[PDB]
Structure formats: C-alpha cells, structure tokens
Amino acid sequence: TQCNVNPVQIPKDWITMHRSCRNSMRQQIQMEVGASLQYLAMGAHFSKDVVNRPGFAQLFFDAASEEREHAMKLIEYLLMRGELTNDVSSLLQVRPPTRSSWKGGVEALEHALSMESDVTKSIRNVIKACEDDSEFNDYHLVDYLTGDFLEEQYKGQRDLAGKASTLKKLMDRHEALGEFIFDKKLLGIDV
Amino acid sequence: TQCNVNPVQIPKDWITMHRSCRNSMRQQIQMEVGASLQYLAMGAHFSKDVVNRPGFAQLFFDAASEEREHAMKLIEYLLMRGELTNDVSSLLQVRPPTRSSWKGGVEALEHALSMESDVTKSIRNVIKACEDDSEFNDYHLVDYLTGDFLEEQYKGQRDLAGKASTLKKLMDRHEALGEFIFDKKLLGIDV
Amino acid sequence: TQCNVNPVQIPKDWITMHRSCRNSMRQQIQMEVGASLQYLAMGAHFSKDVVNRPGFAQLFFDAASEEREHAMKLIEYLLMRGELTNDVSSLLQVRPPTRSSWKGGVEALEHALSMESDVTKSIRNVIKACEDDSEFNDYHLVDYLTGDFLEEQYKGQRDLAGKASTLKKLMDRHEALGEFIFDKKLLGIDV
Amino acid sequence: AQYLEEEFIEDHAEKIRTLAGHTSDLKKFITANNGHDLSLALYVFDEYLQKTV
Amino acid sequence: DYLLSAAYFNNYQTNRAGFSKLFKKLSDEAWSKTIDIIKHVTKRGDKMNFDQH
Ligand SMILES: [Fe+3]
Ligand SMILES: [Fe+3]
Ligand SMILES: [Fe+3]
C-alpha cells in the first residue's frame, strides 16, 4: 500500500552550508545536550535530603533547561539553511553523565565554570571551521555563533566565576552557614 | 543670477569607504530595485481575473515593497558614511522585468526562491569585497550586511522553500483545489 | 593585624584575552576619557556669558557624559572577561584638555567631528589587534566593538558632519543670527 | 473617467499649487535685496518644509 | 526618480531634511499609485504590460 506521497523536488541552490562547518555544528549540538544532562545530575544532587541546597538545585535545573534550548537553537539554524532532510536520528545520543556527586556548592560551581569554558572553546572552534573553510566562508553562521552564543558564554562564565569566588572565600571557616546563606540568596531569600 | 549658495567645505577624514566596496554596494542597490520590479510583475499576474489568486498577488506586492525598502536601506547606509554627494542619478535604472507570466503558484514561488538565492549570493559577494580590500576592511558595513541583510535573506528563503514544498505536493492530483485553499491561507482565511 | 581575607583561587582557563588586544583596549579606555574631558571644555566654553550658546553647551556636556559611558563599557567588558584583577590604578589619567576655546559653533562642530573620526580609526585599530593576533582571534570582542562601538561612531560622525554643513552655509552672511537660531534648534526651540 | 477624477485629478491640483508656491518663495529669496538673505532663507525654508510636508 | 532626489538632499553636504522629506513623500505616493493602477488594470479584465508606451 502507498502510505506516503511521492516526494517532490524544488530548487536547491540556496542550500549552501559546507561539510566541515556542518559537521562541527552537529558535534556542538551533541555537546550542548551532554551539558544539559550533566546539569540535570547537579540539580539531582543538590535536591537530596542529605544535601538540601534548593537554591543550587534550582540554579542547575535551570541551567539544564537552558542547555537544551541551546541545542534546539543550533538545530533550528541548520533547518533554516536547508539541512537535516536526513541524518537526524544520529544527531544525538542520551547517555548517563560522567559525574553525579560534588563535595559542596563550590565544587559544583567550579565544575560548571569548567564545563562552560569547554563549551566556549568548542564554539570558537566551530566558528573557525565555518569561517576558514577555503571553499566557503559562512559569514552568517559565524556572526550568529559570535553574537548570540559567545555572548551568552562570556556572561555566563563571569557569573559562575563570581559566584565561585564569593562562596569559596567563606569555606575556610564558615562552610555550613556560608553555603546555607548563599543557597537561600540564590532563591532570592535574604535571611 | 545667483540661484544657489556657494558651497562650503567641512573636514572629510571621517569619509572612509573604499571604491571596490562602494561599487559593490551601488550594484546591490540596482539589484534590489530589479527584484522589486520583478515582484511587481508577479503581483500583477496573480491579480488577473483569469488567474485570480489574491493571496499570491498580495504576497508578491508585499515582497515588491520590501525590496524597495532594502534598496532604500543600502542608500541610507552610503549617505551615513558620507557618500552620494554626487553620482546619484546613475544609481538606478527602472526597466521592464524579464518575466511576466508563471504557470501557477508553484512556478512563481520557485522563481522567487531562486531570485532570493541570487540576492543572498550577491550580498555575500559585497561582504567579500568590503572585507577583503587589502587597503581597508570595512568592519561596520560587513557587520551590517551580515546581521541585517543576510538574516532577512535566510529566513525568507526558508519561508519560500517551505511554501513551495507544501504546495508542490498538491500538484499531481489537486492542482486547482490545492492552490485555491493555499491561496486563501495566504490571506489568513481558513475555508 | 589581619584586616583582609587570605585570597582564594578558582579555575582560570576561562580567562582568555591576549596581551596585544588587552593593551589596545586599555589605550582605548584612556582615549574615551580624554574625549570626555575635551567635550567638557567645549561645554564650558559655550556656557560663558560672552558666548551664550546654551544649545551648544548642552550638546557638548551630553557628549562628555556619553564618552564617559563609553569608557565604562570598555572597562566592564574587560571585567567580564576576567581582567583587571590588578593594574586598575594605571588605566586612566585625568589631564587638562588641549583646547579650551573655539571661534564659534562651526569650529567646535568640526573639531568634534575630527575627534570622533580619530576615535573611529582607533577602534578599528583595536579590532585589528584583537582579530589578527596570530595566537588568538578574539571573535567576541571584535564583534562587540564592531556592532556596538563602530555603530555609534558612524551615526555620530554623520550627525556632526550634517550639523557642521548646515551651520557653515550660514556663516558667510549670517554668522550671528544663523548661529543663534541653530543654537535654539539644538534645544528644540523653534523661534 | 471617475477613477481618474477621484484618485488622481483632485489631488494633482493641490500638489501643483503647493510646488508652484514653493518656487515663488525661492524666487523671491533669490531676487529681493540682491539675494543677500539667500543662505538663511534656504535654511528657514527647509525647516518650514519639515513642519508642513 | 523622486527617491533619488530624496537621497541627494539627505547627503551630508546638502543636508536638507525638509527637501528630502518632500521628495520621499512624492516617491511613496507614486509607488503606492503604481500598485493601485496595476490593480485597476486587472480589475477591468486587462493585464499589465510593463513595456507599454
Ligand atoms: Fe550551551
Ligand atoms: Fe532584498
Ligand atoms: Fe566614545
């Protein structure tokens, strides 16, 4: 039985992304998804009754959802350029994250800062691949990654670095009370 | 008789565009105007009593006005940079468009997609000329063409490509009713 | 006595600006401050009872505050990237401006246009240093300087150039009345 | 005929009268008092157009 | 043609915002009338020919 419609073909000259750039974008999509899964594990850790840091839990669950949105934005960009008419199933793979426990809020913030730092470096490498391909400099995608993605990365790194510095100063003598107060401030609660 | 005021001169060091970039911009302005005229002809075709596709007519008259706005934006950019104190009359030439009839909505959408694809390629060439001039990399204009003009181009191409795919699937067995319904949807009318 | 807290260290891989780019940014910060001081002197000149051009005075005091904001934006960018943990005191030096008097509004507008033209050229040189460092192309900062700073520069130059042309045409026969009317128009007053 | 009367003809008279008046104003700025006020007059006239066009 | 005049009067040397606005309005009106006439031609059962003299 004929369950589908015989495909039609329309002009394709407008579809211009080159392979190296497209492959770097596909790899970045998997990286964003991997980051969302690692943040979910951080949210889960701080949600435990024996850890009980709801401010940190919410911070990381929010970060997980944001990374999922980053992956979706990259996928939407490829679709807009005429890609992903096939090879969609292989774009992503969900796997358990590498780390599932942290000693305290400082370790988690420093790990998040390092993850963001890795993502920033990876995006800069996608930009290089897309800009320096000898056959096609993808001006628009390079601009999009630079003005949207890197913008979010640098602001995010500075935010995490500041949080880590502020909380770490409290650790030599005020580990419990310092983290407790900092955690409630993440929820907008001034004790 | 003295009908005009003796011209004055002010500092000109701020006027920095170079020739290759400026000439590519002038050529792009004529290209946008040419596109506006070709869209006017599409609007005229679908307005005919024997074609009667008001949704397509409006779509293309709107596109014609938008291309005219693109030409105006490029002209305003040159004026802001201190250009067009002369050589304004030669910037544009209005001529009858090359095509005046289309078999149906699909042919017109595919032709529009191809026209947009040509404009995108031309803008990328203006960017190359403006960025790679060995004597002056025009950072600001390159950024403007990339973030404003290419942005509009890629979104527009995806929109036209989707419309063409959707309507073309209806052509093997539902040419008349399929186009009729699609045309009213362009007007926001769900029959 | 121990008046401060023993410093802590957090990950630093995210701090990536290179020296040539950072030094060009530091020099640009001093240049913006220098421009704010020169505009303050213009505001002071047109505020004198014997000059009495309140429209020009306000125009230049506003420009002085805007240049101070430009300096602050560049400083904030460096802070976001993890810089200025030291070497902050040497970032700026306040010194009397070079010029303190102008023959009239046209001379001041032309001087302002020339100052802006110099700033535009300097920003383009910061962009070159930041983009062309063989070890690190700072994509994000280059994009920020191009899309934010150069945008403001080109619009500002065109505005000043137009004001200078308009007023200068009135100088051969209407120096006093022409400047008086133009000055009130700067205040939004149509006489 | 009615289409031209309604959509073109009525308004043409107003536009032509307006433009003819502008040329008369400029002609006077150029000829009166040896055209001495021309530069200031063009500035004032341009400001007037900004308010009335 | 009017659009080019509007552009010319908006260059930094001429810088006549009033004259530029006058021509921009004439340009916008003529553009709008172009579309209106094309629609009238088709309303009456004819087809537009852009090379008609
Ligand atoms: Fe991300
Ligand atoms: Fe266009
Ligand atoms: Fe500045």
From Swiss-Prot, chains A, B, C:
Domain of life: Eukaryota
Primary subcellular site in the record, as a coarse category: Golgi
Catalytic reaction annotation: 4 Fe(2+) + O2 + 4 H(+) = 4 Fe(3+) + 2 H2O
Uppermost EC category: oxidoreductase
Keyword hit for Signal: yes
Enzyme Commission number(s): 1.16.3.1
One GO CC term, this protein: Golgi apparatus
Subcellular location: Golgi apparatus; Secreted
GO molecular function: ferric iron binding; ferrous iron binding; ferroxidase activity
Bridged cysteine pairs (disulfide): C21-C130
Keywords for this protein: Disulfide bond, Golgi apparatus, Iron, Iron storage, Metal-binding, Oxidoreductase, Secreted, Signal
Amino-acid positions noted as binding Fe cation 2 in the UniProt annotation, renumbered to this chain: E67, E116
GO BP annotation list: intracellular iron ion homeostasis; iron ion transport
Chain ranges of the Ferritin-like diiron domain: 15-146
UniProt subunit comment: Oligomer of 12 light (L) chains and 12 heavy (H) chains; L and H chains are disulfide-linked. The functional molecule forms a roughly spherical shell with a diameter of 12 nm and contains a central cavity into which the insoluble ferric iron core is deposited.
Protein's job: Stores iron in a soluble, non-toxic, readily available form. Important for iron homeostasis. Iron is taken up in the ferrous form and deposited as ferric hydroxides after oxidation. Ferritin is composed of a heavy (H) chain which is responsible for the oxidation and uptake of ferrous iron, and a light (L) chain which facilitates the nucleation of the ferrihydrite iron core.
Family per record: Belongs to the ferritin family.
Protein's recorded name: Ferritin heavy chain
Natural source organism: Trichoplusia ni
Lineage: Eukaryota, Metazoa, Ecdysozoa, Arthropoda, Hexapoda
Gene: Fer1HCH
From Swiss-Prot, chain D:
Biological process according to GO: intracellular iron ion homeostasis; iron ion transport
The keyword Iron appears for this protein: yes
Protein localization: Golgi apparatus; Secreted
Gene Ontology CC annotation, any one: Golgi apparatus
A GO MF label: ferrous iron binding
Top-level taxon: Eukaryota
Transmembrane segments: none
Keyword field: Disulfide bond, Glycoprotein, Golgi apparatus, Iron, Iron storage, Metal-binding, Secreted, Signal
Quaternary organization: Oligomer of 12 light (L) chains and 12 heavy (H) chains; L and H chains are disulfide-linked. The functional molecule forms a roughly spherical shell with a diameter of 12 nm and contains a central cavity into which the insoluble ferric iron core is deposited.
Function per UniProt: Stores iron in a soluble, non-toxic, readily available form. Important for iron homeostasis. Iron is taken up in the ferrous form and deposited as ferric hydroxides after oxidation. Ferritin is composed of a heavy (H) chain which is responsible for the oxidation and uptake of ferrous iron, and a light (L) chain which facilitates the nucleation of the ferrihydrite iron core.
Family classification: Belongs to the ferritin family.
Identification of the protein by name: Ferritin light chain
Gene designation per UniProt: Fer2LCH
